[PDB]
């Protein structure tokens, strides 16, 4: 389970067991989006 966002914007939260497509665009390629947690980078 996830909430993956594909190329050319759209959201498509499904799974990973059978097939990986975008219904709206018709493409098949996905980036995993960044979470909303807090990390700490120093400024040097």
Partner 1 sequence: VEFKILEKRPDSIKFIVSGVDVPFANALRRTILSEVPTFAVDEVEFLENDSALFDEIIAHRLAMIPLTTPHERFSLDALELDDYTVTLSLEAEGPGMVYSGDLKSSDGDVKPANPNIPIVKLAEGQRLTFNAYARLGRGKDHAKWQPGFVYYKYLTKIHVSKDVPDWEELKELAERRGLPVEESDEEIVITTIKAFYLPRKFEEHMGKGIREEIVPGSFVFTVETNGELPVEEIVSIALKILMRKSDRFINELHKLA
Partner 2 sequence: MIVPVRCFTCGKVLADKYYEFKKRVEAGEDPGKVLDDLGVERYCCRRTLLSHVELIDQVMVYKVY
Partner 3 sequence: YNMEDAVIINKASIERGLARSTFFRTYEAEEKRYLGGQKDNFEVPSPNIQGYLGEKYYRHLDEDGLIFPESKVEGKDVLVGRTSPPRFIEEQSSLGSMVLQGRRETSVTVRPSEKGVVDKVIVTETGDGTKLVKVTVRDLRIPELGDKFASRHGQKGVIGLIVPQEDMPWTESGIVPDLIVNPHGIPSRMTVGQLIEAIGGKVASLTGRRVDGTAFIGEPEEKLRKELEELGFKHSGREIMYDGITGRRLEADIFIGVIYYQRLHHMVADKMHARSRGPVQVLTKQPTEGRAR
How many residues make contact with partner 3 (CB under 8 A)? Answer: 15
Closest separation between CB of residue 18 and partner 2, Å? 25
Q: Using the rule CB under 8 A, is 8 a contact of partner 3?
A: no
Q: 10 Å Cβ neighbour count for 22?
A: 20
The token pair at 15 is 């799974």
Total Cβ atoms within 10 A of residue 6: 19
Whole-number minimum distance, CB 14 to partner 1, in Å? 23
Contacts with partner 2, residue ranges (CB under 8 A): 5, 31, 33-34
């Amino acid at each position: 389970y996830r909430c993956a966002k594909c190329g050319k914007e759209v959201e498509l939260d499904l799974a990973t067991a059978r097939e990986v497509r975008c219904p709206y665009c018709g493409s098949k390629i996905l980036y995993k989006p960044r979470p909303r947690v807090a990390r700490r980078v120093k400024a040097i």
